[model samples]
Target: ELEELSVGSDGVLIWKIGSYGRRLQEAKAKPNLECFSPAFYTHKYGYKLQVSAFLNGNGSGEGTHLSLYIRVLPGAFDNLLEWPFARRVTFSLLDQSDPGLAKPQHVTETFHPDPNWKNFQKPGTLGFGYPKFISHQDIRKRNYVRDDAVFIRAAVELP
Candidate 1:
């Protein structure tokens, strides 16, 4: 499904698309390939980020799609945080070889936590991503799948 995205340069956290096929292959893969990160409190907010897979195209998946989102913890939504998060969020799928360009196959989306659903990713959440990123079939051919691991980076401007 989804594994903890490792922090790359700039201490940026990159999400791992692990067990790519298995999550969907498994009959009971949480109904969806996703995971809720442990609570993390930044100077701006206390939140949990959820990264998941959507087979039929969610966020940016035309077929093989991956999604990431953030939610303020119930107890952490008081005064120190910003509501209706409006940040420019970018997700990158690093290619097999960058050639030092550091240019990875990527996509960017604006996040404005769904007000009605509010917590679309979780109880108090607002999430978004590319719906047709790299289809399940194309991912392997594009060299996005290296050693059965596809690495993705999520960059957001947090206030």
Candidate 2:
């Protein structure tokens, strides 16, 4: 059955499939961090993601849990270099057709900066960069279906 799908503002669609007897829902979250780069190069970029899914319960029971992660890269279209100058954001589901009727499913966190990137950071400095979203819950019951969407704004400094 049609589990889930996502559509971009440009009308691009991404889809997914799953089993029955499951609930589905979608959500998004983004946190802004302190910007250290100069104001001249900081640019904001917007991204849109839509998701479609099939509810085994005929859209009556609970839904599936969902989460999304985003980032910004600074470089040419090709041979793009690792833009340390980037940020991470997360998108998650919040409200649904019914509140009390819906079950509470823990949020899932996916996507993180490459481990090599973390090792390159200064020790104990907490990596001077943009914000990131981390998932708190582990994979459990399929109570909600989440189609998370995220937008990121990036800043770069020119020497």
Candidate 3:
């Protein structure tokens, strides 16, 4: 089955990575099993984007952390939208440590796109983000990945 995307009206995208255990095992054998979220727009007719995760980790975080990235894809409104995508984007690993009614403490990172980064250009095939998003040890310490599932969120500041 194809990946399904959850798009928020508020310019937020939530990605649920299921089969966490199995995916991790599969990635171990695949060298690099880059799992990408379904493409979605930050807003209707606005910036198009996608998110990816190297479940087994990659780059400097290889074999230790959960590496993640955000991609800027060519969109219908590219001509109208500003170039060099100047905006704040955020990535977060939702914490479900407690099934209780209390609010969960999430681990997150946010960044502003650099004007000169090629990734922020009109159309990009590559992604740019944290290679050390979160460590495997820490993930186990908390219920970050529960019921063979994990949730990641991406938000873009809309004008």
Candidate 4:
């Protein structure tokens, strides 16, 4: 299912990472954290990421929650995009499964990512998202666990 959203076009995209829980618990929060190959993003904006340990980034201090975000990685086609990027971006957490939906449902309701010019800037990737998307206890309680990993899917619309 993680493959459903990965690199496609300038619209919907997916970013799937393994060890979704163990990684957060052991990895330290840092600036411009790259989870995987940026070239695989497939988006022209070249949005990067910074996965800070949640609850104010108590890096390795507590694993209460994990934060996910998007950062700009100016690429060749970036000049084609309007300066101070503004895209109606949406993110999803397929950390769980539902018998009804039967598919990995988009969970934008939890952290409705509203992107705009103010949220992004040139020379650096800017993005906005909720600091708390899932908790250590919550991830363990559902079918969210798959291959002992989780996936984050993103959708962007140029305005």
Candidate 5:
């Protein structure tokens, strides 16, 4: 039997990457070591997907930024799902500041799938996203990383 899976509420995924300091160190040492978050369902028995982070960056932003991407995985119900997977996917780096003080600021990015993109098809291999989502220098500022961990919230809008 397959292991139990964690499905998100609605279409949102709130993921936390712990030991970020150590992960970054490893990523820097091995460029291929992309940190892949646990796979999650968009909703109860919904589409399967995952979020990947390159602490040291990837492709164009290699060595200077934190590259992030979203990958589509084969879901049991894929045959019944729509093709080309057109929808809005949003990513945000949550600020870890205390609520009692001033309001916290978050860094966010979003994307809409194109009709021609193969990755948006039923379980594509290439992850689609911003290669320069956040620069390494900028991520160093603010409370982006608190207690050796970082929080990333991904929202896949419903049709």
Candidate 6:
């Protein structure tokens, strides 16, 4: 049985909380939210970066949780130049253009430095794009949905 979930922002982040009661009622809505800003950042270079999301069981058989990761070009976010690094810039649930299947929600965003006034690279790093959602569904199961063409748009300014 598919149910409608409530989505909201909590100042610093956004999240979704599932609840049961009335149908499409604002008072009984769950908090759908996520981080307003990126949790990490990368160097100012023309390189490709990859962002992905995963769904894992939450110990219980009926609950599930989502996780995200970012990979900078040549190395991970640790080796990149940035303080108070931005892990994830933004995330969203996008709709698929196809009409047959249910619209899948996709996320995209950019990573930036905290201070926004500090220079961490010698010649400034260039930013590039990378793969997103490499693994959308569990490989062992054929009953899961398959839509892995996710993409992110980002911009980084270097001083």
Comparing 1 and 4 on TM-score, the stronger one: 4
TM-score of each: 0.59, 0.24, 0.89, 0.63, 0.92, 0.28
lDDT of 4 by residue, 57-122 (tens): 333323455455665555555556655655555666664676576755444523334444455666
- Comparison by lDDT, 1 against 2, better one: 1
Better of 3 and 6 by TM-score: 3
Candidate 4 stretches with Cα past 4 Å from truth are 1-7, 28-62, 96-106, 109-119, 124-126
Taken over the whole model, the C-alpha lDDT of each candidate is: 0.48, 0.26, 0.83, 0.51, 0.84, 0.31
Which portions of model 3 show Cα errors greater than 4 Å?
A: 1-7, 97-100
Q: Give the Cα error of residue 9 in candidate 2, in Å.
A: 4.6
lDDT of 2 by residue, 92-138 (tens): 33322245766644332323345466532222213222122222232
Which prediction has the highest lDDT against the true structure?
Answer: 5
lDDT value, candidate 6, whole model: 0.31
lDDT of 3 by residue, 77-127 (tens): 788888878879899999976758677888899998888767788884465
Model 4 poorest 10 in a row by lDDT: 49-58
Query: Could you give candidate 5's per-residue lDDT for residues 26-89 as a string of tens digits?
Result: 9899887787777888877677888989888888988888988998888787877888778789
Q: Tell me which residue pairs clash in candidate 5.
A: none
Clashes of each: 13, 29, 0, 3, 0, 24
The CA-based lDDT of model 5 is what? Answer: 0.84
lDDT of model 3 at residue 116? 74
Model 1: worst 10 consecutive residues (lDDT sum): 1-10
